[PDB]
Design a protein around this ligand. Structure first.
Ligand SMILES: Cc1cc2nc3c(=O)[nH]c(=O)nc-3n(C[C@H](O)[C@H](O)[C@H](O)COP(=O)(O)OP(=O)(O)OC[C@H]3O[C@@H](n4cnc5c(N)ncnc54)[C@H](O)[C@@H]3O)c2cc1C
Ligand SMILES: Cc1cc2nc3c(=O)[nH]c(=O)nc-3n(C[C@H](O)[C@H](O)[C@H](O)COP(=O)(O)OP(=O)(O)OC[C@H]3O[C@@H](n4cnc5c(N)ncnc54)[C@H](O)[C@@H]3O)c2cc1C
Ligand SMILES: NC(=O)c1ccc[n+]([C@@H]2O[C@H](COP(=O)([O-])OP(=O)(O)OC[C@H]3O[C@@H](n4cnc5c(N)ncnc54)[C@H](OP(=O)(O)O)[C@@H]3O)[C@@H](O)[C@H]2O)c1
Ligand SMILES: NC(=O)c1ccc[n+]([C@@H]2O[C@H](COP(=O)([O-])OP(=O)(O)OC[C@H]3O[C@@H](n4cnc5c(N)ncnc54)[C@H](OP(=O)(O)O)[C@@H]3O)[C@@H](O)[C@H]2O)c1
Lengths: 311, 311
């Protein structure tokens, strides 16, 4: 059977594959439902991966990972995994096509999904002015004006963060009330670089081939419309980790997860199930950066190597 | 005063500097006693950093980090730091030459130090067949023979690791007795791909332009000398994390450390001291890889950014 099955081919899984195979794992298989690369391939520009000097698209950034991470014997399985289960001292991987695979160890590296809005223009402008990543994309708008959408802890915290980089932040939310921590709302309210736009909705994201240039917004109470001119629009309307593969036939989870469904790991990326590891945005307290996902992947692979030595 | 003082300019410190400054920290200073880059600059060949497909020396690998990590305003203070201390709500950085600097937050990124033997040829062939990093360099010797020096947990564990990649591992130690865990010695003694050479000392590491080619070894019970032909020599004769800057005037330690002196951190790279973070090989459970060190630096910088917003 497979020595290590890696579920997901974003930076976490790719790095895990590289490390596992270069660490002597003889039969490592990367399961990935599309082309490996993960979420960054949706972005028109990345500049914050340490050691990579030139600013390029996310797709171009991930291109060299394909040859490199497979250079040491990693195998690809292009399929959507439906379920990972533990059976005796190994794992059973069920694919959506009905195929089954068996593995001695497993690294879950399935990432997560920012919640989207379906606002007109969102799909076209995703990654070219529409972002869900303030750390990744904020600095591209240094001394420029941007808008933020949402009323939770993430939206308000990120508005505050962006206010220290951008000239001005328009915080757009569909009610006068917010569900973030009152203390955080207090801080945002007292920041002169944040302009609250409530109760508002965004009706259209406008731009051209080079990206976003304006938002059509509307006051929900008065129906007054306005065209807000900004090159960056940050959407923080929620988030869900991709933990579907953990769900067992009896509805339980494969391994321990937190309140939000993220996989609990220790510093070795070990779950509470022997031979099961996790890496990247799927795990608790993940920073949601490529370098961090890749580090988790490496760490999980090193833990797999140690586990397989004794098993 | 300085917003964030980053102590050490290896991949952890460099990545922290990049992230801190791209996150809007206006006055971030990287304290580094030499040229930034850290331990990888001793190696002649790196291939395992996810996303960098070219195989180049460690010095060349780190060259682009110099421009990139400083592109967003980071400053470099070229000095050896003697101590980091708390002073009311900020920190004082004391240099070995007596200069002092005040900072609002600090990231400790000082790495660690493998112990050197001083054996003839060790300096000459460092990073050219002499290594202290089995993950970094092991795979270069796939299906070749290598030697490992030392008799502790690290030497014997790494001999076992290398025996799963190499054709044969010679485990050389200056006594018949080992100080590793009993079960580890048992595993190694019963591994057919490990040959014990005890009690022996290595008198010289020999090579040519291509790197290491042989060792001169002496049996110290019989005084018999002979040549051992191997292209790779791994030295594991001890290790110390670089935690000297934590030691206070009153001999107390600045923050909580583990039994080996490594800094305790949470998943946000926070120590038990407010405004003090750590990153890289200095912190507990560090995998000792550039991508991991860089991930920690990024994470610590994100925590600095949040800290400074509230302070
Ligand atoms: C708009 C945008 C811009 C970004 N720009 C940057 C940036 O500038 N810098 C940066 O560091 N990061 C950037 N990122 C990437 C970000 O940091 C992510 O956090 C990172 O990609 C997470 O990596 P991961 O490997 O954990 O997960 P993901 O990237 O989500 O990868 C998971 C992979 O698993 C696959 N998968 C999931 N479920 C299954 C299944 N059941 N079976 C098979 N395959 C499965 C998915 O198809 C995907 O390829 C950006 C993200 C976005 C959305
Ligand atoms: C032989 C060898 C080969 C390697 N090759 C690879 C490889 O192929 N792949 C890989 O991923 N990694 C490689 N590395 C690097 C390795 O991964 C290290 O674990 C990594 O460099 C740790 O990074 P760090 O930033 O935590 O610490 P370090 O790299 O140790 O950097 C710490 C920096 O802090 C400075 N510093 C320390 N104390 C002070 C002070 N008091 N004042 C001022 N400055 C200070 C030091 O001068 C140093 O530059 C190699 C290491 C070795 C020894
Ligand atoms: N510091 C912390 O402890 C911390 C930090 C960040 C996140 N978290 C937690 O992590 C979880 C995630 O929260 P998070 O803010 O991502 O989001 P979360 O609280 O769900 O909030 C989502 C927000 O987006 C709004 N929204 C949803 N769909 C929308 C749409 N289609 N159009 C416009 N607005 C829309 C919601 O509006 P309504 O309010 O009108 O429904 C809500 O304000 C929460 O439990 C949060 O507390 C904690
Ligand atoms: N799994 C784990 O928990 C784990 C894993 C790794 C390390 N550790 C711990 O980390 C600490 C460091 O261990 P480590 O093995 O790096 O080193 P360590 O225990 O100091 O052992 C060093 C070894 O190198 C030998 N040596 C020292 N100087 C030498 C020289 N100049 N020439 C030849 N041989 C020399 C020593 O010989 P002598 O024996 O003759 O003095 C000893 O066998 C230890 O506490 C170890 O237990 C724990």
């Amino acid at each position: 059977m497979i020595d290590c099955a890696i579920i997901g081919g974003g930076p976490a899984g790719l790095s895990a594959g590289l490390y596992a195979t270069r660490g002597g794992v003889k039969n490592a298989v990367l399961f990935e439902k599309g082309m490996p690369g993960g979420q960054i391939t949706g972005s028109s520009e990345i500049e914050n991966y340490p050691g990579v000097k030139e600013v390029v698209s996310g797709l171009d950034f991930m291109q060299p990972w394909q040859e490199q991470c497979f250079r040491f014997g990693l195998k690809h399985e292009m399929t959507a995994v439906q379920r990972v289960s533990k059976k005796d001292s190994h794992f059973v991987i069920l694919a959506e096509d009905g195929k089954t695979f068996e593995a001695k160890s497993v690294i879950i590296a399935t990432g997560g999904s920012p919640k989207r809005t379906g606002i007109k223009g969102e799909s076209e402008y995703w990654g070219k002015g529409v972002s869900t990543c303030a750390t990744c994309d904020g600095f591209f708008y240094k001394n420029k004006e941007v808008a933020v959408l949402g009323g939770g802890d993430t939206a308000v915290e990120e508005a505050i963060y962006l206010a220290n980089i951008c000239k001005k932040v328009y915080l757009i939310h569909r009610r006068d009330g917010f569900r973030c921590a009152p203390i955080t709302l207090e801080h945002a309210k007292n920041n002169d670089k944040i302009e609250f736009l409530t109760p508002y909705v965004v009706e259209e994201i406008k731009g051209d081939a080079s990206g976003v240039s304006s938002l059509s917004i509307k006051n929900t109470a008065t129906n007054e419309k306005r065209e807000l001119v900004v090159p960056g629009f940050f959407i923080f309307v929620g988030y869900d980790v991709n933990n579907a593969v953990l769900k067992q036939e009896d509805n339980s989870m494969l391994c321990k997860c937190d309140e939000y469904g993220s996989i609990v790991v220790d510093f070795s990326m070990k779950t509470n199930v022997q031979g099961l590891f996790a890496a990247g945005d799927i795990r608790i307290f993940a920073p949601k950066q490529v370098v961090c996902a890749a580090s988790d992947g490496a760490t999980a692979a090193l833990s797999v190597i140690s586990y397989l030595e004794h098993h």
